[PDB]
Design a protein around this ligand. Structure first.
Ligand SMILES: [Mg+2]
Ligand SMILES: [Zn+2]
Lengths: 98, 283, 98, 1089, 48, 93, 97
């Protein structure tokens, strides 16, 4: 299920620590990534998009994204309405109802 | 920020068509009935009781309305312990209510002073058993059982603490009104007229919202709730301190020339303050 | 007669992955600097502007064999992160072959 | 030139210097002069300064005197400090481990108001250390430097900021004195103004206003334009002046019995009484010019007031409300704005004199408390100053500033420049500035107020980047401690020859131009859109009529170690930083050689450092030996200069001086008479010129490594002498006497052959690890604890320095003898040793080749150093290519053929630069030097070789031969001469190894370090890497048998020495104590199997 | 409360803190049979 | 070696087994003579010697012979810091 | 951008400074532009852009102001390169845990 080892090129062995390899492979290049500004104080720069190490810590902790978006609860079609600054969306199921 | 008050938000529909930077970020619409964060009781208008509860002669009531809750026992609620004798009386309760009023602090703020005064009162029976103490410790340490009964009664407390909650209850500002409108002597006891009477208190009108707000300035807060958040903050900071302990030390370097490390530009507190969820919302 | 067939581990900090520790066969040289093959220098992230390197020596047969087999540089030619080779021609070699 | 014996060094400079380089340790001598109130500073100040010039001692005493008592009856006063000649000299102080000090005396007058009697005496205040003409102090023998300090000037500073939670823009105010308590103000996240008297609980602001005697009518007339301040008033339960003073004495002195008079005497004797709160003249001036107060007035009254504590609030409130303009009721208009904190009009320099002033102040305060303790416990009219005064405290302060501080540092002498940049240094750390709470990332950066005041480049590479820096070359220090740099006054567009030493505050008010800006007729600019700076460093092009000032020279914003890097505008900044900080740590060589291509700032950096010797007086030379030199002046007075020969610097280097004069030589004044460790004819020579070929070789110059000839080892070119000092003390033990003898316990008499009568080693002998140096016997009867050579050390015994108690010279508590042995080692360049150039090009030495297999030229000349091509463009330091080219152009002379006019690439060249012979010396100043036109066609000229053959073409390239094969490399290679530096990073100092030895007996691992003879840290990341391989036995081995397991390492040593299988722990061993103590807790544990 | 003003020590308080075999070092061991030097290049060399 | 690790509550039986004596007296040491006490804290009569190889009595202080239970102190002369790897106990009323 | 374009065009293929790059041995064309073209824009200590660019190369030689304003972002890169290691270490310790 793991597969083969990238070092040997042959199918992986029994007893091979494959979690430490994962941690290292993901962390080592962590300096090639954007980050949160290093300044003592200021305004939250998250107003703009920041999608490097922040996004990764987010996902690996499974906390709620900032620029969240809702996902379809049920397949079907969509009915879209717009008030002033508010979007309303209604999904109508193709087979079921409600 | 900005605040807009009125029935129709159509006044806030101008700030948004000439200054969008606010009409969708900064401006805040409220109606006389939304002032509180958590309820929008607007349609619940009221007859001319408003005039009474909409004019500062009601402030008095509020204060007295708490005084009608700084209650004292009808008869000595007995100390339900074996090797002591009830000292709780309108005497001690009176002494301590006066002491608490005498520091000019809201109710939940002076709860602590009240309880400390009552502990030093019960110190009487803690050491005044007949003449004084009567144990083999009372020749050099007159207070072995003083501060073993009084510093243990905050642990043997359920009876003491619960029967204290009658004379100094931690009021969440919604109840002081619920059980001020239902009753009939509270209105007069605190100074209120009788029109203010009503059966269901939680059926809130437009004219009890500013009262509900002022209650939060009149009462206070717990001051001891955030006790586990300190634990979690400390443990996060410790994890960051360990992160920095992992890193290479200036004396164990295998490089050509010394250079800047992270241990001399950042500490655990700030390193941990940036991996936090640090949720942000608009004004 | 004793430095022969006895591997040694070379390490350079910070060690962000396992190729930052590698086993090598010692060749005894006159001098006081360590000669390092130029192809193991991208894993180590090493250069010769002054950088230092640490040497560890195993004693138990088990560790000698772990070095000879698992750690030897002539076996860790590839990354355990993408399968890419690391011990491959760098700058001088590259321009020569180009 | 302008120096008597100035060896000619032609210059490509196209601009003239209207201001010469000022003294380069006149920032460590002017301040000491000020302190001791010498007459030189006195004159200098009377010229441009008050007509009552007070020093630094005078001022301290005047603030101390008169020492009155509670009864106002008897008074003591000090005056007239006075220094008598030094007891010893610098050389004597070093030879004897003494201290360079002068006795200090003071006139103490003792008045009694009862009887009107006086008891003046000239009392003795102890020996005071002195600043040597080289800008140093001498302490127990060692040269030491008191490095200046950068600190926030006293005054008022307003800082906007953002609330971590509300993300709300708020404001603040902070008043900091030179001495006393702070006074802060805030506008809170809830629009309530408040105060933080002596950094205590934030009570409101009107409380203070009332405590000073203000009525709500006043609070509402002064204020009232605002509505947060009124709203703060309205919510002051503590209405009433005395209720407010009670509130304050409560917050400060909580609970303890109060009093109204105590209240006023606290609110007064904390801010307004000039003994518990003082704004030195600088704080007073800052406050005045900031708030709009006391314009053009006699600053004499240097303390706080009640009008400023109000104008401060008023400024703050018009700040929170966006008002840009203020006017105190009676003051002058003012700009309302925030105050930067890194700016240097707000940062100020505590020089050595100020530091010592402060510590003397401490000592004097203690002596004053003692005076009082001892004045009202002794019969009156019978007490005299000498009875009231105990100096023992003061000396301690002094003996505690040099002996043990952070700004008093062992002198950094790897070379003259290393010590000369240790004195023009600006440190942001030490008691008084940021210590640990503010080592962030916005103070470590460059600020446009650094131009001409602090070098943007020279800052060490270690942890103190942005904290420590070096002062520029044209910069001096105001008396208020603010740093000043000169500019030229423009009047209509025509550069005047008038100078103005401005500071950042003043500079920010005008448009400061650039030195390279053109001029045609006595100053006027040629262009129309000239380039300038502005307030916030905002470089801009502007009309030449908008201009008000101008920079005297380029190289204004650079330091010494950075104005000695040729072609600096061609090298990026990190590698220039490297170049400087490596030019500091360059080891002196036996015979020194100065650069062909260099900069004009190498003569002064050696004269103005002090390792050279210069003539005090004009005259001729009467005698010249290796050690002494003897001059007969014109006045007839005979001078005698003694020279340092093979003396040990504080870093192991050599300090040998050598004469460069012949008997019968009419020297002038300021003329160099001897050269130092790294000078030749009076200019810095830290390295050597080497024949370089820019090319890759057979892999031996890979990844910044580099190659050498064996010539540099035969001729002793990059050789250096290193000296080491070993000391041993024969101190008391209570079992007898630690005796130094030759009758050592039973040992090989063969070890006792290089030892003299007294068991000490014999000069001239050679040593090796373990060899005895001095036989010391501590009593038991007798043991052997002698001084033996350490690990990895050897050399010749130069000489010895013994210090006995039978002379009673001086020795610490419980000692009877000290022996210091010096040993010298000639170290040659070797595989591993680090090597570098002035451009950040560095590397180690991978291969040393015989000259018969070195790329040679058609004339037979083998190159001396091979450098690779691949490191030059990605590292952005091509200044070394230009240096190579010009080195060729200078070792081979040149003749520009002007027969048909001067070529167009030479229309900007200074005549006298149209020709030069071989081995010539030139100068390329950092930002006014050799260009590329002046250097392209100047490579063709290149006078031929002895055989008429031109060995290098107009592109910089030759045609080499493989000294191994024999064939010519098929493409031309870039050849020239490069100035190369040998560094303190040597491999005999880095090679460390261990098998067994001593442990820490606390953590019970081996020790950490090389002198400790320790091991190497196997950390956590390394354990991860050791797990990802799946290696369990190496990890076990490393964590048990090597560091902690104390019963296993022995089994292992024995196994190995016996040749049996190295054992294995049958069951883990760190587990047993925890097993016990969990069983002891009544928790059954069963190791299963 | 032991002599003075302190919490007297206890068996099961050893382990709630840093002291005890249970707390992880996050440090090294300064191992024996080890060394350090400066590395130069050798191109006449094999990978092993 | 081993593979597993199990814990559990301890009865009085397993403890009576673990310990080789009984603790009865309240004191750590004696200042005068700096010699350990007996039958109490710092057992010098059950676990073995004070430092090593000895007994509370010094009757036996040599290596040649080990295990001879001191006919005065009933002590087994041995070394290696046994009194660190040794747990006493009490039978509390 | 136009300068880097014109510069990788104008240069031949037998040039060493372009050869060492297009061979994958070292370097980028950004460095070759900085060296033979223009350094371009540089950073403040805030981390923002100075809209007055450096029109000079390290071949022409930089003026005094240009060199001074390059030092700003040249010092701001020695710390970043260290704090980034602590961030990486945080995440790596998490993942290894
Ligand atoms: Mg390096
Ligand atoms: Zn015995």
């Amino acid at each position: 299920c793991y597969g083969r080892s990238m070092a040997t090129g042959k199918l992986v062995d029994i007893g091979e620590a494959v979690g430490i390899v994962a941690a290292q492979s993901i962390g080592e290049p962590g300096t090639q990534l954007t980050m949160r500004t290093f300044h003592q104080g200021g305004v939250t720069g998250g107003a703009d998009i920041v999608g490097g190490l922040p996004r990764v810590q987010e996902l690996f902790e499974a906390r709620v994204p900032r620029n969240k978006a809702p996902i379809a609860d049920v397949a079907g079609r969509v009915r879209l309405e717009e008030s002033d600054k508010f979007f309303k969306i209604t999904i109508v199921p193709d087979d079921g109802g409600e | 920020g900005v605040l807009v008050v009125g029935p129709t938000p159509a006044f806030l529909d101008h700030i948004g068509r000439v200054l969008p930077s606010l009409g969708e970020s900064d401006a805040v619409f409220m109606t006389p009935g939304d002032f509180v964060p958590g309820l929008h009781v607007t349609a619940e208008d009221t007859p001319e009781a408003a005039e009474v509860k909409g004019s500062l002669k009601i402030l008095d009531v509020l204060k007295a309305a708490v005084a009608d809750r700084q209650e004292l026992p009808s008869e000595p609620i007995p100390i339900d312990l074996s090797d002591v004798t009830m000292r709780i009386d309108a005497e001690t309760a009176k002494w301590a209510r006066d002491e608490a009023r005498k520091t000019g602090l809201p109710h939940n703020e002076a709860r602590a002073e009240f309880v400390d005064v009552v502990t030093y009162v019960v110190t009487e029976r803690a050491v005044a058993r007949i003449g004084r103490g009567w144990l083999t410790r009372d020749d050099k340490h007159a207070w072995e059982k003083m501060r073993a009964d009084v510093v243990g009664e905050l642990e043997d407390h359920e009876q003491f603490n619960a029967a204290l909650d009658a004379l100094w209850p931690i009021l969440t500002p919604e109840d002081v009104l619920a059980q001020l409108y239902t009753s009939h002597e509270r209105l007069r006891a605190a100074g209120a007229p009788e029109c203010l009477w009503r059966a269901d208190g939680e059926a809130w009108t437009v004219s009890d919202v500013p009262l509900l707000d002022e209650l939060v300035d009149l009462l206070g807060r717990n001051k001891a709730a955030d006790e586990a958040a300190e634990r979690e903050r400390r443990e996060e900071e410790a994890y960051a301190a360990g992160v920095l302990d992992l890193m290479v030390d200036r004396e164990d370097l295998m490089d050509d020339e010394d250079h800047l490390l992270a241990q001399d530009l950042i500490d655990a507190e700030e390193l941990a303050d940036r991996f936090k969820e640090q949720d942000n919302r608009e004004l | 007669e004793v430095i022969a067939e006895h591997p040694v581990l070379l390490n350079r900090a910070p060690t962000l992955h396992r190729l930052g520790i590698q086993a090598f066969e010692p060749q005894l040289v006159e001098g006081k600097a360590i000669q390092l093959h130029p192809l193991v220098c991208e894993a180590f992230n090493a250069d010769f502007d002054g950088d230092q390197m640490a040497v560890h020596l195993p004693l138990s047969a088990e560790a000698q064999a772990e070095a000879r087999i698992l750690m030897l540089s002539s076996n860790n030619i590839l990354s355990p992160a993408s399968g890419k080779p690391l011990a491959m021609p760098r700058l001088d070699m590259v321009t020569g072959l180009y | 030139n302008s120096v008597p014996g100035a060896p000619n060094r032609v210059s490509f400079a196209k601009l003239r210097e209207p201001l010469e380089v000022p003294g380069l340790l006149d920032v460590q001598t002017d301040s000491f002069e000020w302190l001791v109130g010498s007459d030189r500073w006195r004159q200098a100040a009377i010229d441009r300064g008050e007509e009552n010039p007070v020093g630094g001692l005078e001022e301290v005493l005047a603030e101390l005197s008169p020492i009155e008592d509670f009864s106002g009856s008897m008074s003591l006063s000090f005056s007239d400090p006075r220094f008598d000649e030094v007891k010893a000299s610098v050389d004597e102080c070093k030879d004897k481990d003494m201290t360079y000090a002068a006795p200090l005396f003071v006139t103490a007058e003792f008045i009694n108001n009862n009887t009107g009697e006086i008891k003046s005496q000239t009392v003795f205040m102890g020996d005071f250390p002195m600043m040597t003409e080289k800008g140093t102090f001498i302490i127990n023998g060692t040269e030491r430097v008191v490095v200046s300090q950068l600190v926030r000037s006293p005054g008022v500073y307003f800082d906007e900021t953002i609330d971590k939670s509300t993300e709300k823009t708020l404001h603040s105010v902070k008043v900091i004195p030179g001495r006393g308590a702070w006074l802060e103000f805030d506008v809170d996240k809830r629009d309530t103004v408040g105060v933080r008297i002596d950094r205590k609980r934030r009570q409101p602001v009107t409380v203070l206003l009332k405590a000073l005697g203000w009525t709500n009518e006043q609070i509402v007339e002064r204020f009232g334009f605002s509505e947060i301040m009124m709203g703060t008033l309205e919510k002051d339960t503590t209405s009433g002046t005395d209720e407010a003073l009670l509130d304050i004495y409560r917050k400060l002195r909580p609970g303890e019995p109060p009093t109204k008079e105590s209240a006023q005497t606290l609110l007064e004797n904390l801010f307004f009484k000039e003994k518990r709160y003082d704004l030195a003249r600088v704080g007073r001036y800052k406050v005045n010019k900031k708030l709009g107060l006391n314009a053009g007035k006699p600053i004499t009254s240097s303390t706080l007031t009640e009008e400023d504590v109000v104008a401060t609030i008023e400024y703050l409130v018009r700040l929170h409300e966006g008002q840009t303009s203020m006017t105190v009721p009676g003051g002058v208009e003012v700009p309302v704005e925030v105050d930067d904190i890194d700016h240097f009009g707000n940062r100020r320099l505590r020089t050595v004199g100020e530091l010592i002033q402060n510590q003397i102040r401490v000592g004097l305060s203690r002596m004053e408390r003692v005076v009082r303790e001892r004045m009202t416990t002794q019969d009156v009219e019978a007490i005299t100053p000498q009875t009231l005064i105990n100096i023992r405290p003061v000396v301690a302060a002094i003996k505690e500033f040099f002996g043990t501080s952070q700004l008093s540092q062992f002198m950094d002498q790897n070379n003259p420049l290393s010590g000369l940049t240790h004195k023009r240094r600006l440190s942001a750390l030490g008691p008084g500035g940021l210590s640990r709470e503010r080592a962030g990332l916005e103070v470590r950066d460059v600020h446009p107020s650094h131009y001409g005041r602090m070098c943007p480049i020279e800052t060490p590479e270690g942890p103190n980047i942005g904290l420590i820096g070096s002062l520029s070359v044209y910069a001096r220090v105001n008396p208020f401690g603010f740093i000043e740099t000169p500019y030229r006054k423009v009047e209509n567009g025509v550069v005047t020859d008038q100078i103005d030493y401005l500071t950042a505050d003043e500079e920010d008010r005008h448009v400061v131009a650039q030195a390279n800006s053109p001029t045609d007729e006595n100053g006027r600019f040629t262009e129309d859109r000239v380039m300038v700076r502005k307030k916030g460093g905002e470089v801009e092009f502007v009309s030449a009529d908008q201009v008000d000032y101008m920079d005297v020279s380029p190289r204004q914003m650079v330091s010494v170690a950075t104005a000695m890097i040729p072609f600096l505008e061609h090298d990026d900044a990190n590698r220039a930083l490297m170049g400087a900080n490596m030019q500091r740590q360059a080891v002196p060589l036996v015979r020194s050689e100065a650069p062909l291509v260099g900069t004009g700032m190498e003569l002064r950096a050696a004269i103005d450092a002090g390792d050279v010797v210069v003539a005090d007086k004009t005259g001729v030379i009467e005698e010249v030996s290796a050690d002494y030199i003897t001059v007969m002046a014109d006045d007839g007075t005979r001078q005698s200069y003694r020279l340092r020969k093979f003396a040990r610097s504080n870093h192991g280097t050599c300090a040998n001086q050598r004469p460069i004069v012949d008997a019968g030589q009419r020297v002038e004044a300021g003329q160099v008479i001897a050269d130092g460790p790294c000078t030749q004819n009076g200019e810095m020579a830290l390295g050597k010129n080497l024949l370089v070929a820019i090319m890759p070789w057979e892999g031996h110059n890979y990844e910044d490594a580099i190659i050498l000839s064996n010539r540099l080892v035969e001729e002793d070119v990059l050789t250096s002498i290193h000296i080491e000092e070993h000391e041993i003390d024969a101190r008391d033990t209570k079992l007898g006497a630690e005796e130094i003898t030759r009758d050592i316990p039973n040992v090989s008499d063969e070890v006792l052959a290089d030892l003299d009568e007294r068991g000490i080693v014999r000069i001239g002998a050679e040593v090796r690890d373990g060899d005895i140096l001095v036989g010391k016997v501590t009593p038991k009867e007798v043991r052997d604890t002698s001084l033996k050579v350490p690990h990895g050390e050897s050399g010749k015994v130069i000489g010895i320095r013994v210090f006995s108690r039978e002379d009673d010279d001086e020795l610490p508590a419980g000692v009877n003898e000290l022996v210091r042995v010096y040993v010298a080692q000639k170290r040659k360049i070797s595989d591993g040793d680090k090597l570098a150039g002035r451009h950040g090009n560095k590397g180690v030495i991978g291969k040393i080749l015989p000259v018969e297999d070195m790329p040679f030229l058609p004339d037979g000349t083998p190159v001396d150093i091979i450098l690779n091509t691949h490191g030059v463009p990605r590292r952005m330091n091509i200044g070394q290519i230009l240096e190579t080219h010009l080195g060729w152009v200078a070792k081979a002379g040149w003749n520009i053929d002007v027969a048909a006019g001067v070529p167009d690439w030479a229309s900007k060249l200074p005549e006298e630069l149209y020709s030069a012979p071989a081995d010539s010396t030139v100068a390329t100043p950092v930002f006014d030097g050799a260009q590329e036109g002046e250097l392209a066609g100047l490579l063709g000229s290149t006078l031929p070789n002895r055989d008429g053959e031109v060995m290098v073409d107009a592109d910089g390239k030759s045609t080499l031969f493989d000294g191994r094969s024999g064939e010519p490399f098929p493409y031309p290679v870039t050849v020239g001469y490069m100035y190369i530096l040998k560094l303190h990073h040597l491999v005999d100092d880095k090679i460390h190894a261990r098998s067994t030895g001593p442990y820490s007996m606390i953590t019970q691992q081996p020790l950490g370090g090389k002198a400790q003879f320790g091991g190497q840290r196997f950390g956590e990341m390394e354990c991860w890497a050791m797990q990802a391989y799946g290696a369990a036995y190496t990890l076990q081995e490393l964590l048990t048998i090597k560091s902690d397991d104390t019963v296993g390492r022995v089994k292992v040593y024995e196994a190995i020495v016996k040749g049996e299988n190295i054992p294995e722990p049958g069951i883990p061993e760190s587990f047993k104590v925890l097993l016990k103590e969990l069983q002891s807790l009544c928790l059954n544990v069963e190791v299963l199997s | 409360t032991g002599p003075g003003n302190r919490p007297l020590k206890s068996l099961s308080d050893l382990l709630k803190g840093k002291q005890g075999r249970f707390r992880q070092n996050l440090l090294g061991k300064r191992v024996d049979y080890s060394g350090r030097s400066v590395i130069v290049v050798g191109p006449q060399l094999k990978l092993h | 070696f081993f593979d597993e690790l199990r814990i559990g509550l301890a009865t009085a039986d397993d403890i009576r087994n673990w310990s080789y004596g009984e603790v009865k007296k309240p004191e750590t040491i004696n200042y005068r003579t700096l010699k350990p006490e007996k039958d109490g804290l710092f057992c010098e009569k059950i676990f073995g010697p004070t430092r090593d190889w000895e007994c509370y009595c010094g009757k036996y202080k040599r290596v040649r012979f080990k295990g001879i239970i001191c006919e005065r102190c009933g002590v087994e002369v041995t070394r290696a810091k046994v009194r660190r790897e040794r747990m006493g106990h009490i039978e509390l009323a | 951008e136009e300068v880097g374009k014109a510069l990788e065009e104008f240069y031949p293929a037998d040039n060493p400074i372009i050869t060492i790059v297009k061979s994958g041995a070292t370097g980028n064309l950004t460095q070759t532009r900085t060296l033979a073209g223009m350094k371009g824009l540089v950073t403040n200590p805030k981390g923002e852009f100075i809209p007055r660019p450096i029109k000079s190369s390290f071949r022409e030689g930089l003026t005094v102001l240009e060199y001074f304003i390059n030092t700003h972002g040249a010092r701001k890169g020695l710390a970043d390169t260290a704090l980034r290691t602590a961030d990486s270490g945080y995440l790596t310790r998490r993942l290894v845990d």
